[PDB]
Design a protein around this ligand. Structure first.
Ligand SMILES: CCCCC[C@H](CC(=O)NO)C(=O)N[C@H](C(=O)N1CCC[C@H]1CO)C(C)C
Ligand code: NI
Length: 168
């Protein structure tokens, strides 16, 4: 009942769009959620933000499980508390092939709506907390390369442009 969507890649200006809150959790929103899950699973990857598939609403899906059967849906997520410092080497479906250390909060408390519009909240640490922060950055138009030096980011940009230089 769902489809894999095209993932935008840096330097696509649409990745800089700031997502709007979801107004109501309609069947249309649930279809977006389902398509985002399908898209996330089509690849090695543990989360996806709607911005990355050119849908500029505050929708995130996550599955950090090894078995890929523990999905989490975050509509209108808000980080309401941050604690501590952590940082791991991150990659991004919208910056394929690039990896870098990103300083993050170690722990976050997040409030969101689930796929059915039910409000909930959770405290996250370790990989879940890092993933949440990475995905919420996407909704703000922010990519992990924005934490890097201009030189490192620009070299990544040029390499990704070369890969798509014959598209369209
Ligand atoms: C780690 C912080 C959030 C990661 C989310 C991304 C997917 C993404 O771009 N979401 O916007 C991912 O799965 N990245 C993967 C990644 O960096 N992973 C997957 C598990 C943890 C770490 C180790 O490679 C790679 C395979 C692209
Ligand atoms: Ni990403």
């Amino acid at each position: 009942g769902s489809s894999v969507l095209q993932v935008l890649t840096f330097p696509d200006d649409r990745l800089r769009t700031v997502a709007k809150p979801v107004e109501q959790v309609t069947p249309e929103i649930q279809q977006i959620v389902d398509d985002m899950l399908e898209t996330m699973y089509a690849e090695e990857g543990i989360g996806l933000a709607a911005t990355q598939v050119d849908i500029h609403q505050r929708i995130v899906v996550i599955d950090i499980s090894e078995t890929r059967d523990q999905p989490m849906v975050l509509i209108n997520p808000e980080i309401i508390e941050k604690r501590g410092e952590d940082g791991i080497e991150e990659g991004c479906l919208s910056v394929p092939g690039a990896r870098a250390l990103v300083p993050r909060a170690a722990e976050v408390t997040v409030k969101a709506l689930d796929r059915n519009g039910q409000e909930y909240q959770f405290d996250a640490d370790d990989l879940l907390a890092i993933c949440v922060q990475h995905e919420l950055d996407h909704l703000a138009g922010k990519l992990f390369v924005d934490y890097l030096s201009p030189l490192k980011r620009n070299r990544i940009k040029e390499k990704l442009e070369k890969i798509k230089r014959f598209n369209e």
